[PDB]
A paper describes a structure:
Curli are functional amyloids that play critical roles in biofilm formation and adhesion in many Enterobacteriaceae. Two outer membrane proteins, CsgG and CsgF, form the core apparatus for secretion and assembly of the curli structural subunits. In this work, we show that CsgF forms a stable complex with CsgG via a 1:1 stoichiometry by lining the extracellularly faced lumen of the nonameric CsgG channel via its N-terminal 27 residues, creating a secretion channel with 2 constriction regions for curli subunit secretion. The free C-terminal domain of CsgF recruits and binds the secreted nucleator CsgB, creating a growth point for further addition of CsgA subunits.
Residue numbers in the entry:
A (entry chain B), B (entry chain A), C (entry chain E), D (entry chain H), E (entry chain F), F (entry chain D), ...: 16 to 272
H (entry chain c), I (entry chain a), J (entry chain d), K (entry chain b), L (entry chain f), M (entry chain e), ...: 21 to 54
The structure:
Amino acid sequence: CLTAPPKEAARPTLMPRAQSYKDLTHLPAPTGKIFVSVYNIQDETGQFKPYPASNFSTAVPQSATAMLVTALKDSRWFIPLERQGLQNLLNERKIIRAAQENGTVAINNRIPLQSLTAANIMVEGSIIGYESNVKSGGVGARYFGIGADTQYQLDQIAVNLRVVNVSTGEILSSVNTSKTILSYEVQAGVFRFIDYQRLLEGEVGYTSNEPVMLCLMSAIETGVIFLINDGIDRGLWDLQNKAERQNDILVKYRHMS
Amino acid sequence: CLTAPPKEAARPTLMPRAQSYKDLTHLPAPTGKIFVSVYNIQDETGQFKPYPASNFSTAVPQSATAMLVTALKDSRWFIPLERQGLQNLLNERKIIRAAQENGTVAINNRIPLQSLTAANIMVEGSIIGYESNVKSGGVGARYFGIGADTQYQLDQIAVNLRVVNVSTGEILSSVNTSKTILSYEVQAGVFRFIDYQRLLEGEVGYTSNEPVMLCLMSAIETGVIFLINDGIDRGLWDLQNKAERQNDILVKYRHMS
Amino acid sequence: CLTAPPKEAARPTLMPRAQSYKDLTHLPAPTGKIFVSVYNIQDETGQFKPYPASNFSTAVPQSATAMLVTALKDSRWFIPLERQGLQNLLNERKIIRAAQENGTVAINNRIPLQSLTAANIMVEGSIIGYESNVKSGGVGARYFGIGADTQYQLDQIAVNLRVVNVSTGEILSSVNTSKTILSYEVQAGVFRFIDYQRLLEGEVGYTSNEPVMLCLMSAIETGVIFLINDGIDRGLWDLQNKAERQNDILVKYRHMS
Amino acid sequence: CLTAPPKEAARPTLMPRAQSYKDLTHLPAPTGKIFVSVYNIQDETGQFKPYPASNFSTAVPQSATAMLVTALKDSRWFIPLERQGLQNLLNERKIIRAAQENGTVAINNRIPLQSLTAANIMVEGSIIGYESNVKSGGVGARYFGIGADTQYQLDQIAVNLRVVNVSTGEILSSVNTSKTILSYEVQAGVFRFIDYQRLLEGEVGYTSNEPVMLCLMSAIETGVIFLINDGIDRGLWDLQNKAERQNDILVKYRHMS
Amino acid sequence: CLTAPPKEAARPTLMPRAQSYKDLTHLPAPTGKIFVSVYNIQDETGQFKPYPASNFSTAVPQSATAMLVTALKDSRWFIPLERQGLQNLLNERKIIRAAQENGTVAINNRIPLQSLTAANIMVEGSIIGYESNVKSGGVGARYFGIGADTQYQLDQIAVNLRVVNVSTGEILSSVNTSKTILSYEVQAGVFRFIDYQRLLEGEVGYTSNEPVMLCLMSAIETGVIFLINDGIDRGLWDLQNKAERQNDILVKYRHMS
Amino acid sequence: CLTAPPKEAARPTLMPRAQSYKDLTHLPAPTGKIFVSVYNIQDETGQFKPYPASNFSTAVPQSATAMLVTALKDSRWFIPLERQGLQNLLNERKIIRAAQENGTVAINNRIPLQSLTAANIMVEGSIIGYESNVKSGGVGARYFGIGADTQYQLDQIAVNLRVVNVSTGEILSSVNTSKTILSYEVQAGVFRFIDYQRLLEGEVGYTSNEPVMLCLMSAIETGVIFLINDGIDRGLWDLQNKAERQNDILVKYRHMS
Amino acid sequence: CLTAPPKEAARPTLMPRAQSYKDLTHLPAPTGKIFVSVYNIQDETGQFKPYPASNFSTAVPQSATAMLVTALKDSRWFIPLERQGLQNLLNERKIIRAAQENGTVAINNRIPLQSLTAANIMVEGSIIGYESNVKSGGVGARYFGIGADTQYQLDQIAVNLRVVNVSTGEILSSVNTSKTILSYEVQAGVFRFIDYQRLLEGEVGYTSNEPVMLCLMSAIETGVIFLINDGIDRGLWDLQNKAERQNDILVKYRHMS
Amino acid sequence: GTMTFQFRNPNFGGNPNNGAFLLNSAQAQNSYKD
Amino acid sequence: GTMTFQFRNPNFGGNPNNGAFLLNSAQAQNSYKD
Amino acid sequence: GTMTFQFRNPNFGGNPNNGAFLLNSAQAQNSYKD
Amino acid sequence: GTMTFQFRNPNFGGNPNNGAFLLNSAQAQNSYKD
Amino acid sequence: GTMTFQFRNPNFGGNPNNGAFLLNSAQAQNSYKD
Amino acid sequence: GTMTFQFRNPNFGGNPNNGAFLLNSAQAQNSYKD
Amino acid sequence: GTMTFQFRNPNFGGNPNNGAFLLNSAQAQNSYKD
């Protein structure tokens, strides 16, 4: 009818990942996956969306620390501890204990808490900036009646990731990866008389604002690859097969630096 | 009369579920339903609706953790503990105790508290982003008098779900599912004279903004299916009948990854 | 289709660094890298972006203390302790202890905490100001039909860095580095009739707002070079080879003062 | 390409200092540099920038106490203790102690804390006011076609500095220095027909808003010179060579009062 | 070039003082300067600047208690204790003690704390009001082509100062001084044809908004003179030479009451 | 020059007092001045200035309790204790004690604290209302060319003063005094042709918005006179000379009730 | 001159009281005045003034509890204890004690505190509503040239007063009194040509917005009369002369119910 | 609410968007000539 | 974002600044007479 | 409230939407020729 | 920032202040008659 | 309050809604020909 | 601040209040006929 | 305050409400023909 809520358009697939993900997943396996601990990749950018967007709509999402975890988990290199919403985890462990500290729980479904597995490093970070319209542009020409244009803006988003060694507290590596969100628009409109009094107007439009979350995800995936390279380089998490030191991927991100 | 409040239009049916729900409900039954614990799938998107919507109207609802619970409960795979509004549950248990710690409650209606059933895993998560107008568009042509147009926007919403193992605190699986909310509009208007001074104007319109809550519900249902697959794959919650490893559904969401 | 989210435009490379970085990385190696401690290079500028940007969008990012760390780490002169998000580091050490204070952790993956390595100096700082349109301008001339213009603004951003000696609490050196963000715009438009009733209009545009985060990064890198010079000058962190006192770079930033 | 972020315009030099700095640095050396303690030169002006600037953008920066420190450090007269972000300094000393209170730190890199060097005086202060458009103006004349104009505004910023004697708590000297920020604009535009139907329009513009941070820095440097004079006058911090009592600079700022 | 930040316009001189200051400084010296204690001359006016100024820009500055101190210090009558930012003073004394309570500080630079010198009276106060446009006006006449105008507004600012006797807690004197900030504007514009088609337009403008901080400073200086008179009158702080009871200045402000 | 800050317009005289002050000062002297205690005549009006004034600019000032003190002090009837900013007074007494509790202060400048002189009554109060445009108006007529107008508004401000007896806690007298702020405006403009093409336009304007602070001061002074009358009437603070019971002033404000 | 602040318009008389006050003051005297205790007649109306008034300007004042006290005090029926700003009263009693607990205060001016006189009832209340434009209107007719109009609005304000018996805590009486603020406007304007080219325009205006504070005062006075009647009726505070039970006033407000 | 009175004429009355009508409401009523 | 649909015609559609063009876009197309 | 005085004429007075009427209120009053 | 796409034509495109020019930019280009 | 000075002419002065009157206030005053 | 670039032409450029002038700035420059 | 410079011409200068006057301030000054 008219009163039924709208039917669903597309299939909710997995989040589309850029090349950097299919570039990150295929890394050489290390000796052993490292327990990692990511607490809060906060939103240090201090930028909010301009008009007409609401005043409070943050420019880049507060997503990170939920995208960096996925990045680390994807490459077969890190095992990410939670450490985010850790208070919920500790409440659930409090409840597990208070539920089986009488021994009366059914011998089947009793959860053997070991202890909070603690991580050897900690990947802190930040979104060190989201500048809008770093480089605008756009050409538009319109002959008699027919016209066509174009606009494009770049929003540059930079992300910083620091692998701090939790033992001695010092920082081991720190990488800054940028990404250029591209937001463009195309139109073509016809507004010429075709006959004495038959006005033919028409107009086709299109616009693509690359989503900030996907650009941030690609930036963080590249940041993770750079962390893995800066580690493999000097002292940390050496690979399983040293022959793969010159891997096709570990030479691409080795030369970008 | 004129002063009676409006009469009700539609029947308040169940919430319309996408294909992914009828795709999620029909999963192979596991050995045993797993107690799960979902605390807060917070709103990490940091996005608020643009003009004319109020400044504070959050883009995606704070609904989640009340939709993820339904998702888990629907598939015959998880039994969701509350752990959300847990403080109310603990107040009600405090009251049960203070009401029957005298033994004077009628032997019929006395509630045998066992202990807070604690869950083996914990499905944390987030809405890692809601970008508006990721891809706009719309064509409109208008001949003499008669005209017709179209517009459409995509709002991409991404959701992250992490099954953290409560025993050792580490994360077992983490999935990112996206959904593309489609909001389109159609119009057709006639504004031509038909006679010397008989102006016939007319206009028909229509618009469908797919509701964000339903797209989020479909995204979370797909996320739950991906969690169940990433578990069934490696080590966790093996199925009841291993022959159903290649089920029609568990091969669809196995190949989307 | 039309409902797929946009595909990715550019490769998320490393953050483009100015000349001052390739001028900073090639510094003479000291006797030994100094443990440094950077707590919070706060946003003392108290400036927010004008219309149309949202009211709360801070002019310069809160990035700093995540860019100064990278600056210090890059030059082979300082080893930056965390001291920022230190509370997360202390939580992770609390968890390491509570996880291996039973000795039952597997002898392989036990993390030998030493103690929080403490730094000999501390590089405090601030963004002492971001003034907008310190010097505007722009010429535009338009003959018959054809026209062309230009605009440009300078946003001056100043950064202060103080190397405070943590032993005695006094300040050893304090440098103020400025940077002039350049934001310019070019257009050229043709709006002349070419025939009796064939109106040829066209217009090409372009605009470059140098990103504030990159200018701030260059300002901080120059600040770090000035700190290293003001130290090398009097008493601190003498070089490995005194012959490099008159290095090509340490004479450039020595004469800028 | 089009998708590369903008390249850097200018070299991030030192902050341009006014005459008052090259007038302040060349002061006669005293007997001995005085330990000074500057806590917070707060923003007592209570002024925010008008439209179109955001509502919260403070008129003068919260920079001060990071510019007064540089002022004091520059003249070879005061050694500025931190006392600002002192809590970070005390945290770092807490960490130094907790790191070497076992004596197990390597005998090389152990930091001998003495005690927080305490200062004999304390230079408190304020920005006692920033009035906008204290004196506007601007003439513009335009003959046939050709026209030219001019505007200028003065923003007066006043700064108060009080050298309070920390021993007895009383104030020794208190100076009020003003500065007149000059913000002017020039335009010249030609809009006359030159031929029958050849319209030649053109326009050149320029604008200079002296940055508030630089005017505040010059005001504070003059304030520091006045403090040094009001001290040298009566009882405090007598010079090394009394013959320099009538120095070229100490007679200029002695007669301004 | 074009990218250099603007050069400095004026010399940051001392704050221009009204007649009341050169009327206040030349007061008869008393027997002995009185220790005075000024805590907070708060902003009781509750007025914020109208449009276009930001909503939060307070009408009169929060400067006072940093201008009243200067007023008291200037007249050779009061020695102003700090008592404002006293917490910073007490922190610095805490540090002096913790730095020399071991006796190990070098016998030269040890600061002999006596005790916080306490004041016999206390000059509390307020800005009891800042009314805008108490009396507007402005005439403008324009003959053929040539025209000229004028506007002027008065903003009245009143200040209250109470010398409370700290011994017995009662108030000794309380004075209310007003000041009329004058803000005027002049323009003259010529817009007459001078020839057949030679339009000569021109316009000269000027505007002076007397700064609120300077008017407040003059109001407070007059308030201080009235306090000194109301004291000299009855019982307090009698002059050094009673013959100067009828001084030229102490008879001017004696008859204004 | 052009860059000098504006010179001062008027002499900062005493606050202009209405007739009610010269009506209040000349009251009959009582037997003995009464110690009075005024804590906070708060702003109970809950009114903020309309457009264009900022949203937060309170309609009537928060001045009161600094104007009521002056009112009480002026009439030779009450001695006003501070009790406002009392915390500052107690801090200064704490400092006096901590400064002379060693007896080592110089026998000259030691302050003999007695004890906080306590008052027999307490004059609480409020600004019970500030209504805007209680009665607008304004006539304007304009013949051929010449025209003249007028507008006027009344803003009524009411003040309540309660003399509460501190011994027994009950209220002795409570008076409500109103005042009608008058804000008027006059203009006269001539816009008639005087010759064939010689347009003579001219316009003179004027406006007076009586300041709210002065009307509030007059309202509070009348309130104080009414308090003194309501006391003299029944039982309290009887006059020195009972013959002055029928004083010229005490019969004017006796019959207004 | 032009720079003198405006001179005062009207005499700050007593607050104009409606008929209900001269109807309330002349009540029959009771046996004995009752100690009453009014704490806070809060602003429960939750209404703020519309445009153009500031957003925060409360519709009805927060005056009440300072107008109800005057109402109770006026009728010779209640003695109102303070209980509002009671904390100030208790501070002043603390000071009285700390000032005479040594017995050293001069035997003349020592204040014999008895104890806080406590009241037998308590008149709580609220402003239960202020609705704007409950009933608008206004007629305007304009013949050739001459025209005249009228507008009027009613703002209804309701007040609730509850005499709660403090002994047993229950409510004895509760009255709801309404008042209709009347805000009207009249204009008359003439805009007809009177001669060939002599345009006579003229316009007279007037407007009266009855002040909300005075309507609230009349509402509260009527509420007090209704309280006194509802008491006299059943059991409380019986009159001195029972013959005055049928008083002219106590029969008017007895029949309004 | 409060009735912030304001003239109807644009001259000596502020609101200028009323000038087009008022004067036109008098040229249309002008019954005079010569 | 949400597409708050709204007619294009000024009559029965609200936005009045569109009336000048729409009608003019029909008198310019009017191919009828008598 | 405060009466923020402001001229009525557009020239030397700011509010420009008043220029259409004022001048038209003088050409309509212009009783001069030659 | 986001490019909230919107038609340029007033009809089926909303922004009505563009109708005066667009149609006038076609009557000025109309090279047809009869 | 502060008097943020601003030219009255639209050219070199910004406020453009004043251009219709100013120039019209000079063609109406133009007493020149040839 | 940031220079949010935007076309000057009303067509394909948004700001419609510019259409009255631009086209008029071309009919006034049109030196063609037939 | 800061002087956010902005062209006066509508073309290449943004503020379009100035186009009606500027061009009219040149046709009124056009002393050319043929």
